[PDB]
């Protein structure tokens, strides 16, 4: 059984305005869009800017999305951005209730 | 029974330095004051800048306040700022352990 | 029994890239390094920038560290920076799942 919640701390979900405009798979790191305040895919440019993980896939036309706001996740189940800094990747969720480990 | 904790995830409280100088009702979104570091009413200008919800009303002369730091709240019980952007309102707590839904 | 977890809300830990290059004791407030994205000692310059508390001491040569990401801690057990603003100290963890009280 390949655990996707490589942690015991209960995972909880939340809903929020989505600013994503393209098919996005589940288990994708999310960040807040500085200009609109909507949740979009985490760009990997800053550690701690990832405020959530997509729970269900998005078609790209949804006005809202569902995300995990807490819990410990398996690094391998998460869909990271191409060639993301390893340090920013390790601390992507630092500051929130989310974390991830091997 | 009109639930005010439209969620199951346990709500927890915390205390912190208040920078509010006016009667403020309970269930009000709080943000950190950039200049002083004290907690004041959330201005609705940025998504994810709301770090807490006032638990008890403030006279406006308190040096400290009590706030919920986690849990899922009913959008309707929270006292939002006049004409706040709906997207910033939906994701006001994104990044923290707090969230809110209908 | 001098409680170090002056709270009931379960404490949880996480791992992350450390940017600390000197012996650092356990129970030390951590912040994210703007330039590298690595976790380093909280400088006390901003309220809410403390994203964690060191769980185990660091020699100063580790590439990773372990930190508590949630829970309520005793202000007295935490190792604060010399002459840190009291307001920024009180709200050092505001926004995260962490808090601290007497």
**Domains in chain B with CATH codes:** 1-102 (2.40.300.10)
DSSP state of A81: P
Is C94–B51 a contact, with Cβ atoms under 8 angstroms apart? Answer: yes
C97 touches chain A (CB under 8 A): yes
Is A17–B101 a contact, with Cβ atoms under 8 angstroms apart? Answer: no
Exposure class string for C14-51: b at 16+ Cβ within 10 A, else e? bbbbbbbeeebeebbbbbbbeeebbbbbbebebbbbbb
Residue A80 to residues A45, A83, B2, C6, C49: CA-CA distances in angstroms?
A: 12, 8, 40, 37, 24
CB A37 within 8 A of CB B88: yes
CB A39 within 8 A of CB A20: yes
Nearest residue of C to residue A101 by CA position? C15
Nearest residue of B to residue C99 by CA position? B14
Structure token pair of residue B57: 């009303």
Closest CA to A10 of A93, A71, A91: A71
Structure token pair of residue B51: 């770090």
CB B16 within 8 A of CB B65: yes
CB B68 within 8 A of CB B98: yes
A14 touches chain B (CB under 8 A): yes
Nearest residue of C to residue A71 by CA position? C12
Considering only CB atoms, A38 lies closest to which of B46, B87, B95, namely B87
A66 touches chain C (CB under 8 A): no
Rounded distance between C-alpha atoms, residue B97 and residue B52, angstroms: 9
Rounded distance between C-alpha atoms, residue C24 and residue C49, angstroms: 18
Rounded distance between C-alpha atoms, residue B87 and residue B14, angstroms: 26
Interface chains of chain A (3 or more CB pairs under 8 Å): B, C
Is C38–A47 a contact, with Cβ atoms under 8 angstroms apart? Answer: yes
Cα B60–chain centre separation: 16
Sign, Cα dihedral of B70, B73, B77, B80: positive
């Amino acid at each position: 059984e390949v655990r996707i919640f490589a942690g015991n701390d209960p995972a909880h979900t939340a809903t929020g305005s989505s600013g994503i405009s393209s098919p996005t798979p589940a288990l994708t790191p999310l960040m807040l869009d500085e200009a609109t305040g909507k949740l979009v895919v985490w760009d990997g440019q800053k550690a701690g800017s990832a405020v959530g993980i997509l729970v269900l896939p998005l078609e790209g036309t949804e006005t809202a999305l569902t995300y995990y706001k807490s819990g410990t996740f398996a690094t391998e189940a998460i869909h990271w951005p191409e060639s993301v800094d390893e340090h920013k990747k390790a601390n992507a969720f630092a500051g929130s209730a989310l974390s991830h480990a091997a």
